[PDB]
Automatic annotation (TrEMBL):
GO terms for molecular function: metal ion binding; single-stranded DNA binding. Residues 2-102 form the N-terminal domain. This is ArdC protein. Keywords: Metal-binding, Plasmid. Pfam families: ArdcN, MPTase-PolyVal. Residues 125-248 form the Polyvalent protein metallopeptidase domain. Mn(2+) binds at H174, H178, E202. InterPro entries: Antirestriction_ArdC, ArdC_N, MPTase-PolyVal.
């Protein structure tokens, strides 16, 4: 009946139940046109695909199913994704409403199309991605990986100390996600830092890093972020639209990375 709550409570459950929704992939969800879902809806459809065991990336509405050449298997229940309708004021103002979609594995008769390994060394195509992001990446024998907004650079340790390029680039993807949201770019940090503002950042960063790593073929590192799920639980309980604001920032952090990395002069 209430959307923000309804969605926040699914996410609060997943956290308690073990895995927060957005970690569940370890294929990104698509609409009937091939356009990928964004933001909070990627998160929601991921948890939904895990919880119902879906193999397909595609989600349809009853309308999209029927008038495409198919039928929603009766008994099948959809799940709630997010979008905007309009109210009039003086086709005018947007407002957030939910809606129901069904995965392709709940549907019969749909058309035909509908259903790596990196060692321990530098990878050229990954190196080109992060070089094309624009990020000051500095390397030093200091054994910590971090983003310093004050200098505005990412510091990686040396790749060989990782004994895993997959571990090396996931960590970099994570820092690249933080690197967005410096004042010159996405403008996301708190002004005055504390246990709450670090908690928000690394949640945006986490959700965002899953989104990034899904595209780059990497696996996110979740050891580093075990001390926060409680603040996330607390903040998610006290604020029923907080998860929407995080997922929107997260998607913007992934978008900025990939868009820069394709800024072909
Ligand atoms: Mn971080």
């Amino acid at each position: 009946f209430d959307l923000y709550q309804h969605v926040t409570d699914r996410i609060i459950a997943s956290i308690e139940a073990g895995t927060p929704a957005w970690r569940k992939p370890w294929q990104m969800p698509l609409r009937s046109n091939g356009e990928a879902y964004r933001g909070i809806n990627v998160v929601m459809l991921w948890l939904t695909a895990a919880e119902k065991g879906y193999r397909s990336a595609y989600w349809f509405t009853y309308r999209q199913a029927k008038e495409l050449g198919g039928q929603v298997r009766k008994g099948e229940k959809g799940s709630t994704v997010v979008k905007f309708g309009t109210i009039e004021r003086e086709k005018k103002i947007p407002y957030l409403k939910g809606y129901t979609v069904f995965n392709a594995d709940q549907i019969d008769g749909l058309p035909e199309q509908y259903h790596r390994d990196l060692g321990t060394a530098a990878d050229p195509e990954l190196d080109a991605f992060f070089a094309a992001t624009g990020a000051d990446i500095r390397t030093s024998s200091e054994p910590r990986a971090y983003y310093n907004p004050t200098g505005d650079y990412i510091h990686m340790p040396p790749i060989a100390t990782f004994h895993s390029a997959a571990g090396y680039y996931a960590t970099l993807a994570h820092e690249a996600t933080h690197w967005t949201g410096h004042k010159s770019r996405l403008d996301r940090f708190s002004r005055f830092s504390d246990r709450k503002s670090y908690a928000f950042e690394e949640l945006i960063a986490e959700i965002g890093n899953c989104m990034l790593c899904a595209s780059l073929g990497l696996i996110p590192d979740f050891d580093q972020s075990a001390a926060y799920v409680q603040s996330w639980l607390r903040a998610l309980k006290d604020d029923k639209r907080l998860i929407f604001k995080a997922a929107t920032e997260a998607q913007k952090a992934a978008d900025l990375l990939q868009e820069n990395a394709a800024n072909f002069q």
